[PDB]
Ligand SMILES: *[C@@H]1O[C@H](CO[C@@H]2O[C@@H](C)[C@@H](O)[C@@H](O)[C@@H]2O)[C@@H](O[C@@H]2O[C@H](CO)[C@@H](O[C@@H]3O[C@H](CO)[C@@H](O)[C@H](O)[C@@H]3O)[C@H](O)[C@H]2NC(C)=O)[C@H](O)[C@H]1NC(C)=O
């Protein structure tokens with residue numbers, strides 16, 4: 138490590154720690170920028186040489202983290218928790234946690250190489266015919282094909298291509314990750330990830346939330362299963378068993394809005410999926426990002442700066458470069474460069490993803506003048522919820538009319554049921570998946586799920602919570618968890634379950650501050666400068682204050698609460714329950730062993 142980046146001498150008291158924090162800040166912005174820049178160069182141009190440069194940058198960051206981390210522990214480990222400055226407590230507490238920098242050099246190199254190799258496998262995997270990429274090709278098949286055998290070829294091809302080669306690497310990564318965080322005092326990596334929420338009852342609190350939400354999912358599931366039975370027939374759909382995992386609009390069956398046209402309760406009404414109108418009007422990626430920006434500025438939040446428009450990658454490159462297409466938002470930690478990297482497609486659900494990512498950017502812009510260690514959300518679920526909250530307003534039929542995407546307007550009970558069902562496919566179907574992913578990964582980190590049970594335990598949880606089954610036979614050579622982006626790319630997932638509950642708490646609070654008095658699911662906060670100021674206060678805080686206290690200021694309650702989500706969906710919750718009773722459905726999947734047969738002549742077709 139360059140000596141100019143190493144710590145000097147500081148006194149072992151609060152006066153010394155303030156100077157330590159300022160000196161750390163000056164050098165950390167340099168080390169972080171070089172690491173993010175190297176990752177950007179690789180993720181927008183996957184090559185062996187850019188992987189080498191990114192691993193070199195990662196190794197330098199580990200030397201930096203070790204040097205300042207060991208000094209922080211030597212000087213302040215017994216006293217930082219009693220400092221009077223709460224920002225300083227958070228800075229020192231962060232720096233004393235070394236993570237992968239606890240590993241010796243050879244294991245640091247092995248760790249960084251595994252991250253690079255796992256990333257490459259996921260983002261370059263293809264499905265070749267008798268070759269398709271995940272984005273756009275396989276994504277488009279799962280979203281719009283209604284041929285059972287074509288969907289199966291895409292689902293099986295993807296899970297085999299991405300999952301099978303990842304397994305040996307993921308075993309090695311798990312062991313090294315645990316060895317690293319054990320030296321920071323954590324029993325395993327999952328315990329470190331959960332510690333970010335600073336709640337001793339986290340896992341029990343989540344389980345209680347899911348108990349309140351499960352009946353809504355069970356009723357949506359039975360209603361959609363019935364619609365699938367009418368389309369695909371008794372051979373491929375069991376009305377008392379799990380749904381085949383490739384038939385729900387999405388490679389992971391994680392949200393179902395793309396089969397809305399199969400299940401719409403009142404099909405004679407206006408089409409609430411505005412994708413065809415976007416294409417007819419000639420929308421492109423740039424228009425989608427500018428329309429999202431203008432919602433933020435209508436609230437008197439910040440526009441995107443020039444560096445964002447000059448630096449971002451908003452379409453898949455046409456020179457055939459290999460890129461990581463999975464949409465992501467980037468803070469370069471220099472208070473100037475902020476970017477989105479998205480292989481944008483012109484669809485309604487991509488318009489929502491644009492809002493999701495720009496929500497991350499807006500957070501970065503609002504907290505950029507804090508110390509670098511505090512440039513994060515009050516907790517990770519807060520960061521995920523910002524853009525989704527704006528997207529709840531944008532999706533309303535009234536707002537869509539304002540921006541020219543929905544001509545006919547009506548306010549009757551059937552139109553309300555259509556809208557709420559469409560939103561339930563997006564939000565309620567996701568809840569079991571958002572909950573189960575880190576239940577699986579926490580058990581892997583703890584050793585309760587060893588390599589010999591990776592797929593057995595994944596499919597136990599998928600069936601238990603989502604009520605789906607694999608449409609072809611699987612065994613432990615398959616590694617179907619690895620075919621989901623966040624697993625090989627080592628990004629935690631429980632943030633998304635927290636967000637899908639939290640965003641309805643935020644929506645209720647901002648709608649009240651805006652002076653809106655109608656039904657919650659018809660609120661639009663567009664042009665409410667009062668709502669903007671209440672959101673701005675949260676964003677500018679970073680991680681400087683306990684999230685429970687920030688939440689109480691914002692919504693009046695200091696805990697996650699499912700009641701705003703239930704209140705939003707109340708009308709369709711009742712309607713779905715009545716429909717299923719009238720049709721004599723079984724709620725659940727008591728034939729838990731059932732799997733569908735193979736199509737005739739599969740895969741020749
Ligand atoms: C659409 O129409 C509803 C009312 O009609 C209901 O919803 C339709 C979609 C149909 O399903 C009807 O069969 C159904 O009865 C409008 O909602 C109503 O808005 C008014 C005005 O905001 C609400 O009155 C307010 O109530 C609060 C106290 O709760 C007072 O403080 C206010 O002063 C004001 O009186 C009313 O409660 C609300 N009704 C319901 C059932 O929530 C809705 O505004 C309308 N949508 C549009 C876009 O026009």
Ligand SMILES: *[C@@H]1O[C@H](CO[C@@H]2O[C@@H](C)[C@@H](O)[C@@H](O)[C@@H]2O)[C@@H](O[C@@H]2O[C@H](CO)[C@@H](O)[C@H](O)[C@H]2NC(C)=O)[C@H](O)[C@H]1NC(C)=O
Pocket residue numbers: 609610611612613614
């Ligand atoms: C794990 O599965 C693969 C293939 O997947 C399926 O396995 C069975 C469930 C079968 O009913 C079919 O669904 C698939 O074959 C096995 O590897 C293949 O095995 C077949 C013979 O069954 C052989 O012809 C192929 O060459 C094998 N390789 C492939 C398809 O790539 C594998 O043996 C199973 N067991 C283990 C421990 O991996």
Ligand SMILES: C[C@H](N[C@H](C(=O)O)[C@@H]1CCCN1C(=O)[C@@H](N)CC(=O)O)C(=O)N1CCC[C@H]1C(=O)O
Pocket residue numbers: 463464465466467490493494497520521628633
């Ligand atoms: C499409 C979205 N991509 C993630 C996200 O935006 O959260 C990407 C990749 C993982 C982290 N990330 C970032 O951009 C971070 N750098 C942001 C930050 O932490 O500051 C995604 O994965 N989503 C959206 C809802 C459901 C879930 C899914 O699709 O499974």
Ligand SMILES: *[C@@H]1O[C@H](CO)[C@@H](O[C@@H]2O[C@H](CO)[C@@H](O)[C@H](O)[C@H]2NC(C)=O)[C@H](O)[C@H]1NC(C)=O
Pocket residue numbers: 182184185186187
């Ligand atoms: C993608 O990354 C590669 C590096 O892996 C870039 O290729 C280098 O380009 C410079 C000048 O453009 C040459 O001097 C180097 O010799 C190249 N390296 C290799 C290994 O070929 C390439 O420019 C990048 N592409 C884009 C579009 O940014």
Ligand SMILES: [Cl-]
Pocket residue numbers: 517518629630631632
């Ligand atoms: Cl998280």
Ligand SMILES: [Mg+2]
Pocket residue numbers: 386387392394395486
């Ligand atoms: Mg979708």
Ligand SMILES: [Zn+2]
Pocket residue numbers: 493497520521
């Ligand atoms: Zn996100």
